[PDB]
RNA sequence: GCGAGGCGCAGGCAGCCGUCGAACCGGGGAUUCCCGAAUGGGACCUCCCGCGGCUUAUGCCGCACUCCGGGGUUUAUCCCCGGAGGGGGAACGCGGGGAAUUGAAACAUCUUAGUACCCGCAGGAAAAGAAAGCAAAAGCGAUGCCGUGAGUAGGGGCGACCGAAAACGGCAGAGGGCAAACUGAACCCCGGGCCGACGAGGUUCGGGGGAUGUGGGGUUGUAGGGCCCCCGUAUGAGACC
RNA sequence: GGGGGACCCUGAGUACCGUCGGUUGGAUAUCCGGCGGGAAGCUGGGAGGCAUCGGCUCCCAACCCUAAAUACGUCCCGAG
């Protein structure tokens, strides 16, 4: 919306920042067995609990 | 808030780059709960400089960014310079 | 930077030190983003803990000196 | 039977003697020493049980 | 408003006769103050003159004392306020009721509060 | 001394000046508010006898109580021809214990210890409760009322150890008939009342 | 403490930390954002807006409601000082409110059941506890829990079903205090001072309580205690701090 | 520390009765509560499964505290 409140707009830039993918020296130390994390979100698809 | 614990780190992208040449203007990115006296103080006090004016924002990821306005005295080229930002 | 030398210097120029390690911090993250040849990456976090040492050996001499 | 005196707390932390023959609290040493005394010398001799009941009872143990 | 335990009123000057009566007696003689004391003693028989506070409240504290001087025959008066009566009776706190076993310098005084009283209602 | 005077006034109100005194008391009382904090207690004897001393920690409160019984609020799902009572029930606590139930809400730092009946018309009962103050100084020093400050010893109203709270459970009674009552109302399955 | 490695799950790059003893382990400290009983005042967004003192300024300490024990005064509960309560906790605990499916081969007394659930109040356990009791050739001698008494006494459209205690054998065992008679300020708390050892104890001053009774005394049954009379002691024997 | 007394004290809307609702195995003989009534108090009072009278036995309410043996496991050691 053009009008928001601080405090979501925090929680939605803490959940903007949490959707990003694994990174690949992660996945390498790793040796692949961690591939992905259980925050990874679309916005059209998956929405947000707020 | 104390002058040297509100600025977190300079901005070097390329449009504080271009502000800083054109409108004699550094960019901080600072604490969020620092409002623009303390910006001001904490910039003048730090940086032996004159300031003529703060605007701040906070981005979506979060963060407080802070553009600083030099007096036409000073040049915000040789303050970039001398933290490196060239 | 080691307590048993924090410890020789009085509180006025650990103010000073933890003034300019800010400083420098600062500096340094920027630099980080600015430019990827940084020789050492351990720099940001040995210097945030230099910080913390200087302020805890600072509120232990303040707890000393009222006592 | 000893008599030394046990240490309770109170709902502000503060200090108490209780007596463990009895479950009595005190918090004054003088208090407790009366107490103790005037309330189980019949136990050395220095005294009687007080009740029927009770003298039956000390009489056959 | 006057408790229903009174039975008569006493007039100022009388109150104050029978405060400093009681304060010569305690200076000199002997007295009892306190209501238990005070029962005590005109139930053994041993007072000459009772005082009873008219500020007494709750009133069963005091409400046996008339009747009960009036079966003893032991002349009883009314003061106005208990903490007079304590301060004259020589305590740092009120006290309801006193009584007064000895006159000591007081004989005369006693006497002439008894036949008062007794001329007044007795 | 004065303590069996007050008593033997007291034993029948309506057969000495009481009688006049309480109607005048109760006129000036149903005045007043439900729980009130008054400076002395009206039958020092009871108080006295229930454990009331004259220092500090020590205070009374007058509770106003409405008397009969209560009435059940209206069951809203099918009940069966033995559950629809509504009128005709009774508290199974004595008005003495919810009147000290209530004077414990108004003042929630004290405890109550005792209470006694001072009164009633034909619509209100007055009770006055005698309660203390745990943290002070003089309680704590006074070892007949000092187990007063122990932990285990809060609520104890709420938790029915008065006298009321006792009467209440039944424990008044031992031997024959009091199988029910000990060591709680909830050990022997809610059961003895 | 341990003794050469270390930088979590987590096998990478680059670096730094450690012999001035790290990493790691046990103990003690420091920092400890915002909301939350949330408490100076507000919440359509865990973010905002105030009033008094100190502070040169950077900044600090107070300001919620319901009460207890005190003080001043503006007598408004207005201000000040000391102290309390609120919320949380898997199961267990204490005190109250309290159904229906179901069984009775239907169903209403009854059963389900003082159960599910609800309200209130505590602890590491809670509750009970020392006989106005039980028992009848004899007796026992506070309370609780275990075996058993016993599916017995007894309740019940005497239908379905419900349902104990005493006694006996064990675990553990512990008994005390008020009100009153009587005496009558000999008393308690708070804040200072000294003697003592810094402690126990002893003592002095100010303030708050206290004769509507602080303190001493006293606590029980063919009775106990007080008070009065007589006889006898302490020069000794405990107990506790 | 013991013997005598001729004097004093020993808990009230309480114990208890009638009635109503609940609860209980408690049955005319369980316990709790509401309403009306309500004592003696030491020259005294209560209990002994309907009520009362007499005998006998046991006890002293209407005030308070009390450790151990007991319940549970958000936790830990140990075992299968
Ligand atoms: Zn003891």
């Not at chain 6, 207690?41 to 108080?47: E, Q, V, Y």
């Amino acid at each position: 919306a053009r009008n928001k409140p601080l405090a979501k707009k925090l929680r939605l830039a803490k959940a903007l920042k949490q959707n990003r993918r694994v990174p690949v020296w992660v996945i390498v130390k790793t040796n692949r067995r961690v591939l992905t994390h259980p925050k990874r979100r679309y916005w059209r698809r998956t929405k947000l609990k707020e | 808030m104390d002058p040297y614990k509100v600025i977190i780190r300079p901005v070097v992208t390329e449009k504080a780059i271009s502000l800083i040449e054109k409108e004699n203007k550094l960019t901080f990115i600072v604490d969020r709960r620092a409002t623009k006296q303390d910006i001001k103080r904490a910039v003048e006090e730090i940086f032996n400089v004159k300031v003529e004016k703060v605007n701040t924002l906070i981005t979506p990821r979060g963060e407080k960014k802070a553009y600083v306005k030099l007096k036409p005295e000073y040049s915000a080229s040789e303050v970039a310079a001398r933290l490196g930002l060239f | 930077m080691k307590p048993s030398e924090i410890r020789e210097m009085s509180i006025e120029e650990i103010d000073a030190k933890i003034r300019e390690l800010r400083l420098q911090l600062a500096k340094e993250r920027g630099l980080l983003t600015m430019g990827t040849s940084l020789e050492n990456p351990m720099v940001i976090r040995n210097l945030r803990r230099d910080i913390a040492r200087l302020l805890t050996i600072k509120k232990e001499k303040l707890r000393e000196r009222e006592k | 039977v000893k008599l030394k005196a046990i240490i309770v707390k109170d709902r502000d932390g503060e200090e108490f003697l209780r007596c463990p023959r009895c479950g009595m609290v005190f918090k004054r040493r003088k208090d407790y020493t009366k107490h103790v005394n005037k309330a189980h010398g019949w136990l050395f001799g220095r005294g009687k049980p007080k009740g029927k009941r009770l003298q039956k009872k000390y009489l056959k143990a | 408003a006057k408790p229903s335990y009174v039975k008569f009123e006493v007039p100022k000057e009388l109150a104050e006769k029978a405060l400093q009566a009681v304060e010569i007696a305690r200076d000199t003689g002997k007295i009892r103050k306190g209501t238990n004391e005070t029962t005590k003693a005109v139930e053994r028989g041993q007072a000459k003159l009772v005082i009873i506070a008219e500020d007494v409240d709750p009133e069963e504290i005091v409400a046996h004392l008339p009747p009960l001087c009036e079966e003893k025959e032991i002349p009883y008066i009314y003061v106005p306020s208990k903490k007079e009566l304590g301060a004259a009776a020589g305590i740092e706190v009120a006290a309801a009721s006193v009584a007064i076993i000895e006159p000591g310098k007081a004989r005369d005084l006693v006497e002439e509060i008894a036949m008062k009283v007794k001329e007044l209602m007795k | 001394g004065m303590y069996k005077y007050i008593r033997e006034a007291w034993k029948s109100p309506k057969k000495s000046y009481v009688g006049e005194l309480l109607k005048q008391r109760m006129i000036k009382w149903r005045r007043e508010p439900v729980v009130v904090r008054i400076e002395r207690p009206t039958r020092l004897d009871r108080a006295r006898a229930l454990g009331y001393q004259a220092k500090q920690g020590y205070v009374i409160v007058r509770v106003r109580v409405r008397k009969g019984g209560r009435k059940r609020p209206r069951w809203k799902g099918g009940r069966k021809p033995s559950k629809m009572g509504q009128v005709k029930y009774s508290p199974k606590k004595s008005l003495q214990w919810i009147a000290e139930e209530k004077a414990a809400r108004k003042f929630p730092n004290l405890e109550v210890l005792n209470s006694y009946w001072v009164g009633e018309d034909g619509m209100y009962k007055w009770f006055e409760v005698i309660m203390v103050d745990p943290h002070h100084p003089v309680i704590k020093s006074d070892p007949k009322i000092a187990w007063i400050a122990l932990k285990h010893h809060k609520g104890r109203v709420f938790r029915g150890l008065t006298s009321a709270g006792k009467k209440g459970r039944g424990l008044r009674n031992k031997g024959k008939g009091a199988e029910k009552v000990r060591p709680s109302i909830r050990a022997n399955e809610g059961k003895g009342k």
